[PDB]
Amino acid sequence: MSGYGLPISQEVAKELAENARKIAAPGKGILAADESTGTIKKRFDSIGVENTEANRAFYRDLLFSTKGLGQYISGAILFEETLYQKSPSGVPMVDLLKAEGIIPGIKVDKGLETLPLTDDEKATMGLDGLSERCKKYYEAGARFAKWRAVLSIDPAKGKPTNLSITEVAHGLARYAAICQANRLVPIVEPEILTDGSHDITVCAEVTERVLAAVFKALNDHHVLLEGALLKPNMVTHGSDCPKPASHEEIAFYTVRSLKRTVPPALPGVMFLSGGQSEEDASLNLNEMNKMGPHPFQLSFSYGRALQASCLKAWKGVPENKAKAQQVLMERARANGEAQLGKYGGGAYVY
Amino acid sequence: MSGYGLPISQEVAKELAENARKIAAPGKGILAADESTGTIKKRFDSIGVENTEANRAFYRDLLFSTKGLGQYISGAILFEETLYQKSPSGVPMVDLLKAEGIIPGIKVDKGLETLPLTDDEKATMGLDGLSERCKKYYEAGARFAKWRAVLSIDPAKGKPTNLSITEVAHGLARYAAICQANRLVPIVEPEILTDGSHDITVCAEVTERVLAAVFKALNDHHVLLEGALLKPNMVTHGSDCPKPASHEEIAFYTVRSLKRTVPPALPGVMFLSGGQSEEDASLNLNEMNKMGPHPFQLSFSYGRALQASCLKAWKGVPENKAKAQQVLMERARANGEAQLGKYGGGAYVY
Amino acid sequence: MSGYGLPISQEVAKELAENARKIAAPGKGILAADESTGTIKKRFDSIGVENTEANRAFYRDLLFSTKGLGQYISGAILFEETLYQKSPSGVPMVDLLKAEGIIPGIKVDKGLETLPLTDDEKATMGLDGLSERCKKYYEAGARFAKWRAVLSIDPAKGKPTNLSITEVAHGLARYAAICQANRLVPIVEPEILTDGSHDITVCAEVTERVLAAVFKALNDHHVLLEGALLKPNMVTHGSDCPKPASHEEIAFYTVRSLKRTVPPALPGVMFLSGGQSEEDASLNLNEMNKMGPHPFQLSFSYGRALQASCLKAWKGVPENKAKAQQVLMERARANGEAQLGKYGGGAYVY
Amino acid sequence: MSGYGLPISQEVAKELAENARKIAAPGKGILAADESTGTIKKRFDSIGVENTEANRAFYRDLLFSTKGLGQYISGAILFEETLYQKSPSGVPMVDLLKAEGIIPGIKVDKGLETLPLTDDEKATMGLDGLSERCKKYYEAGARFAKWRAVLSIDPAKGKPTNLSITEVAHGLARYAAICQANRLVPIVEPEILTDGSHDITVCAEVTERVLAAVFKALNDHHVLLEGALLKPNMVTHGSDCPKPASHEEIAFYTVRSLKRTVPPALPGVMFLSGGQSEEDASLNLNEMNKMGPHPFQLSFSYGRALQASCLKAWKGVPENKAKAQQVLMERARANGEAQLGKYGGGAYVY
C-alpha cells in the first residue's frame, strides 16, 4: 500500500538473515569483548592492570587467539579500537577471529545521557553519523552491531517511566533499521538493570512491558526480525535481594517473558549476564534449554560471565596467558553446552 | 511494581489456558456456527430456505448431532439464540455438543457501526453489559467467546486508516480482558477483508501492521496470551484479482505474517475462511502445516468452508439430513487432516 | 489526503459551534441536574426525602421553573428520565427550560465499570446504541450531551495508570465524535477525583498528562473542537488534606494546566465542582476570571455547588419551594458573576 | 507523583519564558540568517557570488550592522560559523546584534537523513553532543536555538507516513528538552513542504495532524511551552498549483490549524516563509493579524522573505551595501507592521 515501508532489498535481507542464524548457531554464542576504554579500566582495575593500549591489545589477542574458541563462539563484539587494532605480534584482531570462523561485530552506540527532567533515566546516543559508521565497519569486516540501552526498576519512583521506555524503544528501532540498511545484523539490547530489592515477578512485569514496546517500535520502523537478534536481561530478583532466585525460577520467568512478547521470526535471544557469576550465567541458560525446544534460539552474549576468571587468571602477567586461555575455553564450553541444555555444572505461573 | 496490572487469578488463568489448548488441539479445529439472524438468512437464501426459528433449530441440530464430529471439531461457536435453544427433538444444543466432547463457545459482539468521519470504516460494538453477559454464558456452558472486527484494504483511500486500526485493537483488547475476567477464552478476530484488487504482498503488509497493533493492545490491557486464541484472515490476493495466489504462496505469506507479529505464548491461530472455497480453505491450511512444526497451532475456525456443501446437500429438505451430515464430516476430516499437514486433496521472501 | 477524516458537514458543524458558544456564553454557565436514580438518592438521603418519581419531578420542576434562571444558566444537563418527564403541574421539563431560553442537555454515558486487572480503575460504558440514542434525544430537544469518565490519583499505586488514561481518552473521543455526527455538542468530562492527600502540584501534573492524552485522542477521532466543551476538575489539593489551597493557588494552577494542554479553538471550559462548597466553587471560578481575558471561556457546570443549599432549603417540604428557588437564584447569580470575575463574595510557578 | 517529570528549575524556567516573550515581542520577529555553507551557496549562486568565508562575513555584517534593525527584529538565527565570526572590520557578529538589542540564536540540528525503507522521508539528526553544544553556544551569547524537521505531502504515496511524523515529533521533543536544560529557548520547526499540487485544505489537514503529534510529544518529554516557540509552515496550496490561495484563505486556514492544535501557554508562533515571495509573506502575516487578538503572538522567522531583495540589491558588490541595508529595513518594517496587522502593502470553514 501507499504509506507502508518500501520493500527491503532481497539480497540485503538474505545476507542479514543468514548471518543472524550463523550468530545464533546451536551450541554457540557471543563473546562480548566490546568494553570501551572506561569500562575496560574497571575490568582491569579489579586485577590491578594499567589500562594502556598495549595491555588492551595483549588481552584482546589473548581472547581471540584462543585455539578452538570457534567451537563455542559464533561472534565477538568489538570496541572500535579493537576492530582496527593489531595484536602484539602484528596480526589484525579481525584476522584472529576469521581464523577461528568467528564473526566480528561492532558496538556502535555512543553511550548514555540523562533524559532531561527524569531521575537520571538514560537515553542512548549515537544515531548521528551511524549510517556512515556502519558502512566503514562493514568494510573493516564487521557483520553485526550492538547498541545498549539501559532501564532501571524503582517502584517508589515509577521507574522505568513512560519516557524512558519510549526513548529506549525509539533509539533501538532507529539503530536497528540503519544497521540493516548497511548490511549489519543489529543486536537489540534493552538492558533492565538489576539495581534494587524488587522481586523476580516485578522484573518479569517490567521486562514484558519493555519488550512489548521495543518490538512494536521495531515493527513501526520496518526492522526485519529475521535479520536481527535480541540481547535482553534474564528475569531475576534485584541485586539487593539477599536470596538469589533459583535457576529453575529464573529460567521459567525468563522464557515466559520472552514467549509473551517476542515474535518467533526473530532467530535468536542472546542473553546478557548483567553481573551474574560465571556459574550462574551458565546454569541459568542451561535450565532454559532444558525447557526446549523453543521458537527461537536461547543463547548467550556474555562479557563478564565469559571473562571474569580469565582476567583473574591472567593478572596482567604475560606468563599466565595459556592458563587464561584455558579458563576462557572452560567457560565457552560450559555456555555452549548450556545452549543445548547439556551443561553438567562446574567448579506454570501465570 | 505500582502501576502495573494486578496478578491474574492463578485458578482462572489455569482454566483459560487449559481450555485454550483444548480448543487448539492437534488434528482439530472450530466449527463457526454463530451466524446471526441476518447472516444465516443470507446463507439460507442461497439455498432457498425460509429463515424461521424451526429451520434454524433443525439445521443447527443437523450440524451438532453429527455422530463422530468431535474427532475433528474441538469447539463450536454459537449465536446466543442457539446457546439457549433445543433441537426439534427437544435436546438442548449444548447437550449435543457435550455428547461429542465439543466445547461450546459464544459470539459476544453486537456487530459493526461506522466510525464517524471515516469512509465507512467499522467499529465493533458490544462492550456494554459484556461482563454480565459473559457470566450468564459461562453458566449456560460456554467456555470461549468470539468478537469480530473488520478492516478494509483500499490504497487509494488509505484504508485501513490509523483510526480504524486503533479502534479495532482497543475493542478487541477490552473484550479479551473482560472475557478472561469471566473465565471465557477470547477468540480475537481482526478480519482484514479480501475486498479489492490488491496483491498478496499488500495483504501481508496490512496484516502485519494490524496484528502488531492488536498484540501491543492485548499487552497494554493485561490479556493473558496463554488463555487466548487468534482468528485472523489468511494472507491472500484481493477477491477482485483474476488469479488466486497459489496455496504455496498463501501459506508462505500467512505463516510469515504470523511469525513476524504473534508472540509464541499464544496457543493457537484458528483461521477464518473469509469467502474461500471449501477445498481452498483445506489446501491452504494443509500447506501451512507442511511447513511445521510451528510455535503455535495453526488450525481452522471455519463457517462457510465447513458448511457450504452441507447447506447445498440439505436444501432445506429434511430427508437430505444424513447426506448433509456426511458432507459435513467429509469437510471436518479434511480440515482436521490439514491441521496435521496430512490432507491429500479432495473432489524465502523478506 | 487519502487516509484522513472525511470533511464534517458544514451545516452540522455550524450548528454545533453556534450551540457550543451559546452554552459558553459570557456571564452564564451550566446547571448539572443529571443525577441518576442512585445518585439523586444520595442527594435526597442527605435531607431525608424519599427518592420517588413524584419527588424527583417536584424537585426538577422547582429547579427549572425558577423565574429568571436563564439570566445566569445557559444550559441544563438532564438525566434521561427528566428529559421525558412532566412537572407535577403537567408541563414538560424541556418546555420549562425553553421558556427561560435554557438549552436542554442529556447525560448519555451508562456509568462506570472496573477495568480488568486494575486496582478498581474505571472505564465509562455507553457507546453501544449511543448514536441511536443521540438521534432520539435531539428529537426530544437536547442540543448537548455529557459523558463522565473518572480517574484517581494514588502515587503509591501508580494511579492513574497508563491503561486508565488510555481508556478514558478513547471512550471520550468515541463519544464526542458520535455526538457530533448526531448534532449534539459533546461535553468531555475527564474528572480527576480529589480522593487522597496529594498536593495541588500533583493534581496539576496529573491533570496536564490526562488532558494532553484526551485532546490528542479527540484529534485522532476527528472531533470538532469548535463544537465541543470541556468539563474538567479544577486543580486542587486532595480532599484528605487538612489545608485547602488558597483560591489564588487553585486559580493559578487550574488556568496553567488548561493553557498548557487545551487548544484555543475549544470555546468553553465548564468546571465541575467535585465536592467543593458552594462558596469555594464560586470564589475559585471568580479568581480565574480575574486573570482574564482568556483564550476560551472559563465557566461552570455545577451540580452540588448550585443545589446544595437549595436542597437544604427545600427539605422535601413543598411549602419551602419559593425559598429554595431564591437560594438557587443566589448561587446562579454568584457563579454568573464569577464567570465575569465580578463576584464579591457571599455568606508564576513553572 | 512518582513517574512524572521532575520539576524544572524555577530560575531556568523564568529565563526561558522571559526570553521567549522577548523574541515574540509585539511588532517584531526573527531574521533567519542561519543558512549552512551549502544553503548559502544556493542563495549566493542565484546572484553569482563566490561562497567564500570573506563573502559570508561581509554579507552577515551587512545584515546585522543595519542601523535601526532592532526596531523590527527581536532575534537573529545564526549558523555556527557566524556565531564565532568577526565582521570584515573586526567586530564579532554577536556584538553587532547586541548593539541593536537583537537576541542571538543558533541553529543546532545536523541536517537531514533518509529514514530507512521510506520513500526518502527525512529524520533530523543532531542529538549527539547537543547538550554540550548548547552549553558552549549559551556561553558565546546564544539565547535560543532552532532545529528544522521536514515533512512532505504526497497523497498517492501516503506521505507524510506515520513513521515520518513519529520521528519528526520525537526529534523535536528531545531537542527542545535538551535546549531548555541548557537555558536556550527552543524554536520547534516542523516544516511541511509545499512540494506538490495538493489543495490548501489538504495542507490544513496534514498540518493539524503533524502539530497534534508534535505537541503531544513535547508534553511527553516535559518541554516547557512557556519557554518555547513554534516555527511552522503557513497553510497554503502546494507549490505546483497554478493558483496561489488568497491571502484571506491562507490566513484563515493557518490560524484555524494553530488554534485547533497549539496550547495557548506557548508565547509565539513565528512562521517560516517557505518559498513565498517577500510581499506574500508580509501580506499573509498581516491578514492573520487583522483577525486578532490571538492567544499567542503570530509573527515571522523569515530567511528568504527578509533577504531576497537584499541579496539582489547587494549583487556581491560592496558599493551596493547601503542600498542593500535599506531594502532589508523596508522588509523588516513591512513584517513588523504585519505582526500588528497594520501593513499597508508594498511594491468560517469547519
From Swiss-Prot, chains A, B, C, D:
Describe what happens upon changing E35A.
Reduces enzymatic activity. Enhances MIC2 binding
Where does the UniProt entry say this protein principally localizes?
Answer: cytoplasm
Q: What is annotated as the active site?
A: E189, K231
User: Per the UniProt annotation, how does pH influence activity?
Assistant: Optimum pH is 6.0-8.0.
Oligomeric form and interacting partners: Homotetramer. Component of a complex, at least composed of ald-1, microneme protein MIC2 and ACT1. Interacts with microneme protein MIC2 (via cytoplasmic tail). Interacts with ACT1 (F-actin).
Q: In which pathway does it act?
A: Carbohydrate degradation; glycolysis; D-glyceraldehyde 3-phosphate and glycerone phosphate from D-glucose: step 4/4
How does a null allele present?
Conditional knockdown results in growth defects. Decreased intracellular ATP levels. Decreased number of trails produced during parasite motility. Decreased ability of parasites to attach to and invade host cells.
Q: Name one GO molecular function term.
A: actin binding
Q: What is the effect of changing K231A?
A: Abolishes enzymatic activity. Reduces MIC2 binding
Localized where? Cytoplasm
Its UniProt entry gives the catalysed reaction(s) as:
beta-D-fructose 1,6-bisphosphate = D-glyceraldehyde 3-phosphate + dihydroxyacetone phosphate
Q: What is this protein called?
A: Fructose-bisphosphate aldolase 1
Please give the organism.
Toxoplasma gondii
Q: Which residues bind dihydroxyacetone phosphate?
A: D34, K146, K231, S273, G274, G303, R304
Q: Which UniProt keywords apply?
A: Actin-binding, Cytoplasm, Glycolysis, Lyase, Schiff base
Cellular component GO terms, alphabetical: cytoplasm
Q: What is the effect of changing R43D?
A: Abolishes enzymatic activity. Reduces MIC2 binding
Binding residue positions for beta-D-fructose 1,6-bisphosphate: R43, S273, G274, G275, S301, R304
What PROSITE patterns does the record tag this protein with? ALDOLASE_CLASS_I
Detail which positions bind D-glyceraldehyde 3-phosphate: S36, T39, K107, E189
